[model samples]
Target: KEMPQPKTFGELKNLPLLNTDKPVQALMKIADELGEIFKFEAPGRVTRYLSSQRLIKEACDESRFDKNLSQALKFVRDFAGDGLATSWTHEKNWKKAHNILLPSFSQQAMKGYHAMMVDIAVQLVQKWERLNADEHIEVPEDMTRLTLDTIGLCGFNYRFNSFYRDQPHPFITSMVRALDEAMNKLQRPAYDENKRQFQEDIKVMNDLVDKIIADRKASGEQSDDLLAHMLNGKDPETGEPLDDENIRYQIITFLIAGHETTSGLLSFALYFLVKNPHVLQKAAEEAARVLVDPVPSYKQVKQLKYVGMVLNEALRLWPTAPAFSLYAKEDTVLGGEYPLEKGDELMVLIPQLHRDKTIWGDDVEEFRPERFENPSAIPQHAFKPFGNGQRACIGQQFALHEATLVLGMMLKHFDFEDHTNYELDIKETLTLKPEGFVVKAKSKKIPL
Candidate 1:
């Protein structure tokens, strides 16, 4: 049997275009009209979408399918060559980088990075505390700054000093253009100008990361950090250290793929908290209950359950890295009906799958952190905020740890108010972020 799809004009109506504005909404609309499994049969390319929990599960089955790079992610490889996120599952470098860096983000390792995380988070809260009430705080911009600085210090023991400057670092600026290029589906050759600019952007990123590695070597100082780990740690399996160029790719991968996803997630969570005052108050109460001071100690992170749930709910409603693709390992049938060739690709729309009424109950669209209280109650493979198996986010814990710590501290120190009654507008790059979402903060700890 064949999959259900609109045969209208190839990908024109079926596949969500780059300028479809909110492609999330567009694809979800299509999923609603068409059933769970549908195909966008373009001229030569056939891209399928999986929306139901069952189909997604089948697609996620490791024996049947493997991670397939989407167009946007394929573009990411232009800069991050065989890096963790963009690398194939069979790539030796990905394994070496992953294995070498695994312990660096372990529980004890996060503890080592806790004070460093707190250090960057404190800088953000201090910056926000000084803001005038009349001035509006840009959520995405500030969150970007916070995550970048956190990764810079925690991963490399280098500081971007993002708070010191009014503008974003050059690395951020150029990376955006490159990612923007991917999102917009821009092709070179016809526009040499675009190609020229893209090459320059890659150069800026390479130069900065090269400088970080170079400077560390120049100082001749040896302390435990990610850079040191890569320079010293050997893969237990292959018994080899990471190649220097691959290390640069890993650094660029972490810096680019790392911050953007977390920043987007943090911005969305903050947006949800502000929109629902009762939830915000509940979260604030939890923060006050758990945090004895403005910033939470790493030990206290585990106690921030409601805050974690709040972040989880935000992720369920608006997954930052919204989509991932899986390719069939062999000719197989999906959902017991639809057949696929060995090379067929299924794109999993995370937003749609998470919002399935049957899986999530009737109030699927509503933001309720309580749903996550019984994680076992949810069906298997229903919730995937990070990603799927094997190639799932290695930095999953790191992102959650960072978000929980930062969100808890912000809740403890400030009271956020949005007088405008903001309506949500999602901005699309490689990741999804709330555009023009701002807040007015009143510091609760001031007036000494």
Candidate 2:
């Protein structure tokens, strides 16, 4: 008798490769669901469940999630990479809309996000400057903490953390903890109570967001961030203005999108730079060339052409989100010839695409940022780090803009030096991470 096949993403727990190992099944499923080449279930539950918070928990504990982290890191430096950072920051429906539009609009909103991130980076530098006169020093790791605060200004029109002032807000604390828990401990054990507890926590999260929505409504002034824009956005399709619930949905989208993606990128960016002195030097040179001041200006970011390419390369190499799974609209063909059935699942494997030697050349493994200067060489569908077709990330442009601004700013003042040689030990749940990455900081203030 054949071995009993697992029914759910939860069931994959027993498979060695999927359990404590690399979940190769997940990747194979991708190739299979592609139809003519490989065909399996359409809208496969296993594929959908791959992004579940529980799978992340299992993968993290069992050590199967590192693949995600590895791929996510490759996205930024590689074009054939997946948007790993982008995945932690999305919902399926929201992703669809982004595919239809958002790229152009995100470019516009990015200007605002760029300015906000730069301001926060300036604040971080100023805080560091105020703390001591020593050029090189060790201190509490605070970039992770500071990033969420800045994301608020660009995403929700809120500024989180009383880090500068001595006052600490309980609400901010609660929100942070909730977000952290969702990312860190969202493991869904096969046990009933464990699953129940996770569900309950998610409900509480919903309640908390509802409360925030109520409060934001109580304040009548318009916000300048993504939330405000979405809340105020009249659907071009329906010509109907968004209701409060719609606004909340959008707010939640922006909130999640802005927070994790930027944080992960900064962490990974720092991680790679610390290990590769040459890359760090290259980044520093780019930053100095772009801005003479403490921060990169909106204009300066535009002029830093290589910086943009490098960041794009980074997204490809180490994406926060990779492998977008979709159900075929009907029997269709993808990449021009692969036949896709209506009931077959389809996944665009960003990792495979990014690592493909065809588009990126044999040196795709190397961290060369100059490869992106010319886009004509890459295949049309092969280079979607943010995603391809409709249903790509709406905030891709915004996330990139925010990351560039924040990173550019940090490079100006701080050099990220890795103290730990630990293999970029990434723990992936919903988002990819460097898992408690610690780095040494050196300040380089441009002489006023």
The candidate that achieves the highest lDDT relative to the unseen native structure:
1
Tell me the number of clashing residue pairs for each predicted model: 0, 37
Model 1 per-residue lDDT tens digits across residues 83-139: 899998878887788889889878878888898988989888888889875887889
Q: After superposition, how far is residue 423 of candidate 1 from its true place, in Å?
A: 1.3
lDDT for each residue of candidate 2 in 302-336, tens digit (9 for 90 to 100)? 77666677677766676766555444445654434
Worst lDDT run of 10 residues, candidate 1, spans 10-19
CA shift at 85, candidate 2, in angstroms? 14
Instruction: Please state every model's RMSD to the true fold in angstroms.
Output: 1.8, 9.3
Native RMSD of candidate 2 (Å): 9.3
How well does candidate 2 match the true structure in TM-score terms? Answer: 0.72
Clashing pairs in 1: none
C-alpha lDDT of residue 56 in model 2: 22
TM-score of each: 0.96, 0.72
Reference-based lDDT, residue 306, model 2: 65
